[PDB]
């Protein structure tokens, strides 16, 4: 097997645009972008938890990470959505 | 330009035999595939060897004939790696059974 973010990006695209498709090259580019953002946020949260002498990566660490990396509006909406997701995860 | 002029002059098929090369078979498939063929003869059959080659694939996809003649001065390579390819090119006998031989 070989794991990838292809089907998830495809589902998001079909949920935002039901007509327009996506090619293999664009899918690989999107997967690389997702991996880059993931590793950026992970390293940010890791060094943030290290600066506070902590050892548990929690929602606050990822929130600070996205507030530091994503500039301006891209931050705000994101964290809002994030909070929303968190709240929904507390619902079930 | 001379090839295009010749193709234009003979676009209606006012010819008896058309003699071309594999390079002209491939490059000029967009014009020659429109005509149907009944009998084809290919010399230097040793280059046709690969069944998945662009030459054989182009021959298959461009047109379909009933009689196929292969001429060559020496049999397939000693190790006969693509003997089944020549067999399928010649007759539909080993096409569906070559994988077990």
């Amino acid at each position: 097997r070989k794991e990838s973010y292809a089907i998830y990006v495809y589902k998001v695209l079909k949920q935002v645009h039901p007509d327009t498709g996506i090619s293999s090259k664009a899918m690989s580019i999107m997967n690389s972008f997702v991996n880059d953002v993931f590793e950026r946020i992970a390293g940010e949260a890791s060094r943030l938890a290290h600066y506070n002498k902590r050892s548990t990566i929690t929602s606050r660490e990822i929130q600070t990470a996205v507030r530091l990396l994503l500039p301006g509006e891209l931050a705000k909406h994101a964290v809002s959505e994030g909070t929303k997701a968190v709240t929904k995860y507390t619902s079930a | 330009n001379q090839r295009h002029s010749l193709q234009h002059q003979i676009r209606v098929g006012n010819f008896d035999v058309l003699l071309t090369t594999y390079e002209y078979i491939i490059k000029d498939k967009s014009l020659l595939s429109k005509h149907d063929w009944a009998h084809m003869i290919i010399d230097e059959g040793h280059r046709m060897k690969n069944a998945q080659s662009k030459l054989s694939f182009t021959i298959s996809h461009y047109y379909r004939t009933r009689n196929r003649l292969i001429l060559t001065g020496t049999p397939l390579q000693n190790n006969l790696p693509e003997l089944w390819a020549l067999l399928n090119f010649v007759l539909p006998k080993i096409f569906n059974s070559a994988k077990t031989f």
Binding site: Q15, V16, E73, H77, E81 | -
Partner: protein, 183 residues
């Protein structure tokens, strides 16, 4: 060499002037009369109509409440404001609400045909998603128990310093907001 920018409401339900005579007088007044300009005007205000003729405030018959957050700009002292507006109400027309706003504040007369029009456009947007998933959740800005420290959300101030970035910001917000409905 000069560009023209303006807005106006048509009310196409009557027929006393045509989109050609309006341009015939709008360019004669500006003294930039040109056949290409009159045709350019009749080539833009007709598509707006045909695109918006399908949406009318009739047969709504639904007590709907929405937090209208609009922004106006007249290339000087632009402003933004958000309040509670109840659909399915015919007593208060947006023109009267605009006259009230221009009267209470120290605003020139030219702001009356600016906040009303931009408000109608919002109404059309509120009616656009009404043709589909437009369920009205209890969206409130403030209360006391059922349905106030300060009125920081409820602001009608005017700002000279341009925050000329809302166009992308609203589109950014709107695109995510639309996907929020589906879940």
């Amino acid at each position: 060499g000069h560009t023209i920018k303006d807005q106006f409401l048509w009310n196409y339900n009557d027929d006393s002037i045509s989109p050609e005579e309006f341009a015939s007088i709008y360019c004669k007044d500006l003294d930039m009369t040109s056949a290409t300009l009159q045709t350019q005007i009749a080539n833009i205000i007709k598509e707006q109509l045909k695109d918006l003729e399908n949406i009318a405030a009739t047969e709504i018959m639904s007590d709907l409440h929405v937090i209208i957050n609009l922004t106006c700009n007249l290339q000087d002292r632009f402003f933004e404001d958000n309040f509670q507006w109840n659909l399915n109400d015919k007593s208060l027309t947006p023109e009267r609400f605009a006259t009230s706003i221009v009267q209470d504040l120290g605003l020139t007369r030219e702001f009356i045909p600016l906040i009303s029009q931009s408000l109608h456009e919002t109404i059309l947007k509120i009616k656009k998603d009404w043709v589909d998933g437009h369920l009205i959740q209890d969206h409130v800005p403030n209360d006391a128990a059922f349905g106030g420290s300060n009125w920081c959300p409820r602001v009608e101030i005017l700002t000279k310093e341009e925050i000329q970035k809302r166009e992308i910001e609203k589109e950014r917000n709107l695109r995510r907001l639309k996907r929020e409905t589906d879940r």
